[PDB]
């Protein structure tokens, strides 16, 4: 018998740094859901996402959700540095009753909801250089209002336009005004986008409205960090092979517990 057919039902917290997600996904902890503010600037070798995870802030969606989840998971960190973005002429710190924090209306801790100032929204053109040695990850959004009445009362323009560019890429988004099913009694939505800036490069953001602005950047790292979906409890042991069903020993050259593995694991075989 040289095929590993069983596991201990637990993920050992050693030797890899395990970060349990509890009720939070990696993207929600990235944006700054009030329930996920305990995960700020935390590091990991394997992020464990649970099936009980749920969002509890402003309803949003991420075009290409898997790639942003994979890119941040393969970085193994949530370290965030605030940058002095100069939004002169607009209102900041937008909050919502769907994003409660400390029994008060709030918003994503990493995002800045910009609206008009006295029914004027000047064309914001801001430039943020990266004079560092690492890569910066900027998370920004586009707000999609329900009606044209809200479009005007939020941004004082019948339609906004957002352009985030570097010397290498360009991202241009037009908001889509319309009704959507009410999530936490909110029929508007936010679309999340990301941009990577390299050393010597500059972040350029042009917006005439509907911009969910960043408050800074996440540091990007390279390593063997990853993410895994599992409802197995985390335990006090040591094992260099993790599967969603728990840690398995790596004695046998084969295993049939599950294909998704992390670390130095045996090869997978079907069977049962």
């Amino acid at each position: 018998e040289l095929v590993q057919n069983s596991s201990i039902g637990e993920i050992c917290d050693s030797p890899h740094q395990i970060l349990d997600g509890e009720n939070c996904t990696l993207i929600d902890a990235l944006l700054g859901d009030p329930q996920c503010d305990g995960f700020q600037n935390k590091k990991w070798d394997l992020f464990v996402e649970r099936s009980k995870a749920y969002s509890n802030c402003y309803p949003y969606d991420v075009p290409d959700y898997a790639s942003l989840r994979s890119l941040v998971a393969s970085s193994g960190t949530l370290e965030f540095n605030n940058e002095s973005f100069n939004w002169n002429g607009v209102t900041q710190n937008g909050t919502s009753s769907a994003c409660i924090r400390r029994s008060n209306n709030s918003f994503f801790s990493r995002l800045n909801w910009l609206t008009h100032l006295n029914f004027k929204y000047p064309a914001l053109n801001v430039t943020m250089p990266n004079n560092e040695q690492f890569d910066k990850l900027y998370i920004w959004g586009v707000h999609h209002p329900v009606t044209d009445k809200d479009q005007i009362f939020l941004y004082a323009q019948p339609s906004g336009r957002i352009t985030v560019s570097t010397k290498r890429s360009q991202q241009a988004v037009i908001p889509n005004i319309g009704f959507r099913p009410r999530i936490r009694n909110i029929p508007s939505r936010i679309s999340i986008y990301w941009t990577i800036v390299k050393p010597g490069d500059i972040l350029l953001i042009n917006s005439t409205g509907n911009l969910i602005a960043p408050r800074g950047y996440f540091k990007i790292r390279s390593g063997k960090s990853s993410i895994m979906r599992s409802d197995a409890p985390i335990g006090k042991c040591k094992s260099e092979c993790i599967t969603p069903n728990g840690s398995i020993p790596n004695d046998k050259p084969f295993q049939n517990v599950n294909r998704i593995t992390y670390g130095a694991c045996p090869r997978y075989v079907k069977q049962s």
Partner: antibody, heavy 133, light 108 residues
Framework: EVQLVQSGAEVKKPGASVKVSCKTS????????LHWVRQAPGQGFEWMAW????????NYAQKFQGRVTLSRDTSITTAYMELTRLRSDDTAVYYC??????????????????????????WGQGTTVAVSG | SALTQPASVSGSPGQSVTISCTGT?????????VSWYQQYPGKAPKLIIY???RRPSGVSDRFSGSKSGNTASLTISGLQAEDEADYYC????????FGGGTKLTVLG
């Protein structure tokens, strides 16, 4: 057209209480702060208090705290100001004024992070209250 | 916690007048939340200048606002007979504060 129609002129005796109404129209009543400021005969303006018609929160001036009470009626978009223990020094014209800063957009679920005071863009015609013994 | 204005200002038709509005600090000399109001005898005030230098739609371009250090200023050029009124500045210095009021006379 934004309109603030106030109640009629009042003639009260000292020690009594007066309550002035302010019916709004032409805008979302619960989306802007509503101020109350008085002007004594021959003097300048003196801010008394404001109220958040959405939540009911108030902010009275230290000189008026304990004697004035602000309230609203969202159904008729009317706000009220009541002054108790009237003085001869309370004789003035009392104005309700709408604040400039928009603070709520309900259907998109937006609430302004903090209130900033930029001015009062629409005023009521004023309510004259004379307090004589 | 107060704003000071000149009690009275005067000018002839066609000239320019300036009404100052001085405070302390943490108001007119940190935040420009300064608004100006025109009031006719027995009438409700009317906002004529907000954000220090911005003018609501419908107010004549002859009115303008400018700051310095801890003072604000309202300038009325091309003075007319109908410009005679009391002018108040207001801002926020712990609470909503008003100036004492300036009576502007157009010398006839």
């Amino acid at each position: 057209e934004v309109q603030l129609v106030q109640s009629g002129a009042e003639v009260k005796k000292p020690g009594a209480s007066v309550k002035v109404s302010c019916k709004t129209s032409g805008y979302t009543f619960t989306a802007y702060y509503l101020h109350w400021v008085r002007q004594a005969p021959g003097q300048g303006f003196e801010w008394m208090a404001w109220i958040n018609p959405n939540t009911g929160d108030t902010n009275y001036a230290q000189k008026f705290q304990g004697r004035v009470t602000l309230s609203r009626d969202t159904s008729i978009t009317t706000a009220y100001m009541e002054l108790t223990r009237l003085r001869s020094d309370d004789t003035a014209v009392y104005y309700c004024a709408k604040d400039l800063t928009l603070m709520y957009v309900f259907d998109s679920g937006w609430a302004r992070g903090a209130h900033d005071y930029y001015g009062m863009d629409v005023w009521g015609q004023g309510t004259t209250v004379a307090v004589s013994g | 916690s107060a704003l000071t204005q000149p009690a009275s200002v005067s000018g002839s038709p066609g000239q320019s007048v300036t009404i100052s509005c001085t405070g302390t600090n943490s108001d007119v000399g940190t935040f420009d939340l300064v608004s100006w109001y025109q009031q006719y005898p027995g009438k409700a005030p009317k906002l004529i200048i907000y954000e220090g230098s911005r003018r609501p739609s419908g107010v004549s371009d002859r009115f303008s606002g400018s700051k310095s250090g801890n003072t604000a200023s309202l300038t009325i050029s091309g003075l007319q007979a109908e410009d005679e009124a009391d002018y108040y500045c207001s801002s926020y210095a712990g609470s909503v504060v008003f100036g004492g009021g300036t009576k502007l006379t157009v010398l006839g």
